[PDB]
Amino acid sequence: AAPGAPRPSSSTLVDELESSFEACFASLVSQDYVNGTDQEEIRTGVDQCIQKFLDIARQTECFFLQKRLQLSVQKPEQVIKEDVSELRNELQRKDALVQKHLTKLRHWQQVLEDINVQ
Amino acid sequence: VKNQIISQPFPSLQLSISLCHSSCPEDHLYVLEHNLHLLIR
Amino acid sequence: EVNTASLCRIGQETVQDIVYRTMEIFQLLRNMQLPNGVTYHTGTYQDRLTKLQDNLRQLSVLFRKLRLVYDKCNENCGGMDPIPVEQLIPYERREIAEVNKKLKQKNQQLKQIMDQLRNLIWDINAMLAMRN
Amino acid sequence: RNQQLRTLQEECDRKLITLRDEISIDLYELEEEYYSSSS
Amino acid sequence: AKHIFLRSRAAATIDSLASRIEDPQIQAHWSNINDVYESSVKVLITSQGYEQICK
Numbered sequence: 232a233a234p235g236a237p238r239p240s241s242s243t244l245v246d247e248l249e250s251s252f253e254a255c256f257a258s259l260v261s262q263d264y265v266n267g268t269d270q271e272e273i274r275t276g277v278d279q280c281i282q283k284f285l286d287i288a289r290q291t292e293c294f295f296l297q298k299r300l301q302l303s304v305q306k307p308e309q310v311i312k313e314d315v316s317e318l319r320n321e322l323q324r325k326d327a328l329v330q331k332h333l334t335k336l337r338h339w340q341q342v343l344e345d346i347n348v349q
Numbered sequence: 350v351k352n353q354i355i356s357q358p359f360p361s362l363q364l365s366i367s368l369c370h371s372s373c374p375e376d377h378l379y380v381l382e383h384n385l386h387l388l389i390r
Numbered sequence: 391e392v393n394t395a396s397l398c399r400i401g402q403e404t405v406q407d408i409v410y411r412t413m414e415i416f417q418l419l420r421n422m423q424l425p426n427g428v429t430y431h432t433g434t435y436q437d438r439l440t441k442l443q444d445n446l447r448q449l450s451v452l453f454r455k456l457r458l459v460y461d462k463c464n465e466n467c468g469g470m471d472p473i474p475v476e477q478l479i480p481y482e483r484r485e486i487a488e489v490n491k492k493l494k495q496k497n498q499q500l501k502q503i504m505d506q507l508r509n510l511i512w513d514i515n516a517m518l519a520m521r522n
Numbered sequence: 523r524n525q526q527l528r529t530l531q532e533e534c535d536r537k538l539i540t541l542r543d544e545i546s547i548d549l550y551e552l553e554e555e556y557y558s559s560s561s
Numbered sequence: 562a563k564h565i566f567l568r569s570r571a572a573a574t575i576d577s578l579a580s581r582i583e584d585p586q587i588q589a590h591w592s593n594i595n596d597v598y599e600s601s602v603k604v605l606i607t608s609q610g611y612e613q614i615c616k
Contacts (some may be wrong), residue, residue, distance in 0.1 A: 252412075291405065300478055309394060310395055313393075321493070332552065380516075497559045515595035515597075518596070549591075
């Protein structure tokens with residue numbers, strides 16, 4: 232099925248990541264004789280392994296965005312709750328930073344109260 | 350004319366900071382010290 | 391109860407952080423100098439392998455969380471079983487709006503405070519001409 | 523008296539520079555927080 | 562002149578955010594050492610929710 236259009240396969244998107252990752256590093260960690268002469272040889276293989284890795288990564292990310300968009304247009308309540316939680320977290324962080332800055336300025340101005348004894 | 354020196358780089362705001370005898374944007378304090386020190390400089 | 395959107399966001403963040411960790415560990419083991427250093431006896435390589443094992447544990451738990459969230463996503467198939475892919479090309483929320491308005495009011499208040507802080511904080515630009 | 527007033531103004535200038543540094547740290551840290559606000 | 566000009570510039574920059582919110586907002590950063598006549602301001606595009614758009 233080399234020139235055929237259909238892809239007769241399955242069980243991907245999970246094992247593929249670890250496989251691609253360990254692929255071009257097993258070449259490195261190996262209890263085998265290493266000929267002390269090589270140049271511009273493993274580079275092609277590592278470019279290939281990082282290329283396929285980032286490619287399948289992009290595929291997974293695009294699938295994630297598609298699922299997220301379909302979920303939002305399907306169940307907008309979830310996205311609304313997510314946005315509400317994010318806004319709550321942002322407001323909490325802003326209040327915390329404001330309180331920290333206020334306390335710092337207070338402590339600063341307090342110690343330099345009578346710097347000039349006169 | 351008298352204790353007032355009015356000027357305008359372009360018609361947007363006023364000028365002539367001044368003072369007098371006795372008997373918001375904080376552009377009040379750090380406008381006098383410079384011209385004050387200008388004399389001793 | 392579901393948090394599927396947050397789940398997908400966490401998964402994306404996790405895979406991005408995995409790529410970042412790969413880059414970081416490559417940059418780290420990049421300058422793997424001779425362990426038997428002339429000057430340094432046993433200083434560098436100890437912390438080097440420590441951080442190595444740390445990043446290893448990190449990427450391991452990252453892969454674990456990735457598998458877990460992927461299983462959770464692919465298992466909880468609730469809503470739009472057909473899921474038309476061709477439905478992505480075009481031709482109550484009262485509490486949400488209230489929280490948004492409150493956050494906007496707080497943001498405007500913080501912006502006014504920051505605006506005051508600008509003038510109160512320059513404080514040297516006007517008078518650095520004779521400052522000492 | 524000269525040395526006294528000189529040390530006084532020197533400490534004053536040092537305190538002013540330290541306050542400037544603190545204020546700039548607060549501002550720069552808040553400006554990053556200002557970017558967070560998508561409104 | 563420098564003072565009123567800096568004030569007007571700051572006002573314009575801060576009003577730009579209010580005039581355009583849905584559009585990519587603008588971050589503000591000023592120097593920590595401003596001379597009598599000289600000064601500098603750092604301004605970035607800072608696309609929302611992204612950090613890899615600093616072009």
